[PDB]
C-alpha cells in the first residue's frame, strides 16, 4: 500500500539485527534474539507529506538456513547488502549475497542495492574504505555507507538512501 519492503542480507554476525533495531528503535542492545529464519520490524515514516511504512527484514546468515529465508525475499523493494569492516570474509561474500538475492527475489541491473560496511566503531579493520568503495563502483555503482549500529553512525543515513531509492 503505502508499505514498502527492504531486506538486509549479509553474513551472520555483521550486525543486521542490530542495524534494524538501531534504525527503528534508536537503541543498541547486546542480547538480541538469534532467529533461525527471518525477522522484520516496521519503520513508520513520512515522505513527501505522506505516511509511508518501511518494513525492514533480515535473515539468518548461515548457508544451511537458506531455505528458511529465501521465501521472504519476494516483494523486497531494496536490498541492503551488509558486511562488517572488521571482517574481510564478510566483505568477500557480498557477491554471493547479491547473487542469492537476485536468484530468489525475482525483481534488472537497476534494482536498488545499498551497501553497508558495519562496525566502523571497531578501529581494527580487515577491509579498507577504499576497497569497499572500489567494489561498490565496479559492481553496480551502489551507494556505500560505513555504519555503526553500536554508536548509530550513518545508520539512518543509510536507510534513508534506501527509502529514496525505493521511492525513486
Ligand X SMILES: Nc1nc2c(ncn2[C@@H]2O[C@H](COP(=O)(O)OP(=O)(O)O)[C@@H](O)[C@H]2O)c(=O)[nH]1
Closest-by-Cβ residue to ligand X is 15
For residue 59, the tally of other CB atoms under 10 A from its CB is 26
Stretch of 48-56, 71-79, 133-141, 142-150 lying at the interface with ligand X (CB under 6 A): 142-150
149 is in an annotated binding site: yes
Using CB under 6 A as the binding rule, the residues of this chain from 74 to 133 that contact ligand X are 118-119, 121-122
Phi, psi of 72 (to 5 degrees): -105, 10
Closer residue to Sr ion, CB minimum distance, 17 or 90: 17
Task: List, in sequence order, every residue forming a beta bridge with 53; answer none if it has no partner.
Answer: 3, 44
CA distance 97 to 93: 6
Which of 2, 1, 5, 3 is CA-nearest to residue 107?
Answer: 5
Q: How far is the CB of 139 from ligand X (least distance, A)?
A: 20
Q: Which of 7, 10, 17, 148 is the binder for Sr ion (CB under 5 A)?
A: 17
Using CB under 5 A as the binding rule, the residues of this chain from 32 to 61 that contact Sr ion are none
Phi, psi of 163 (to 5 degrees): -50, -45
CA distance 24 to 124: 27
Binding site for ligand X (CB under 6 A): 12-18, 30, 32, 58, 61, 118-119, 121-122, 148-150
Annotated binding site for GTP: 13-18, 30, 34-35, 61, 118-119, 121, 150
Amino acid at each position: 500500500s503505502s508499505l514498502f519492503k527492504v531486506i538486509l542480507l549479509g553474513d551472520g554476525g555483521v550486525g543486521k539485527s542490530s542495524l534494524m533495531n538501531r534504525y527503528v528503535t534508536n537503541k543498541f542492545d547486546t542480547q538480541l534474539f538469534h532467529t533461525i529464519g527471518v525477522e522484520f520490524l516496521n519503520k513508520d515514516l513520512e515522505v513527501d507529506g505522506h505516511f509511508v511504512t518501511m518494513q525492514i527484514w533480515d535473515t539468518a546468515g548461515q548457508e544451511r538456513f537458506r531455505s528458511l529465508r529465501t521465501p521472504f525475499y519476494r516483494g523486497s523493494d531494496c536490498c541492503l547488502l551488509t558486511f562488517s569492516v572488521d571482517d574481510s570474509q564478510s566483505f568477500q561474500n557480498l557477491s554471493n549475497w547479491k547473487k542469492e538475492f537476485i536468484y530468489y527475489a525475482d525483481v534488472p541491473e537497476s534494482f536498488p542495492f545499498v551497501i553497508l560496511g558495519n562496525k566502523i566503531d571497531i578501529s581494527e579493520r580487515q577491509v579498507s574504505t577504499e576497497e569497499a568503495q572500489a567494489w561498490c563502483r565496479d559492481n553496480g555503482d551502489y551507494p556505500y555507507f560505513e555504519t555503526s549500529a553500536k554508536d548509530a553512525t550513518n545508520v539512518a543515513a543509510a536507510f534513508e538512501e534506501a527509502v529514496r531509492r525505493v521511492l525513486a
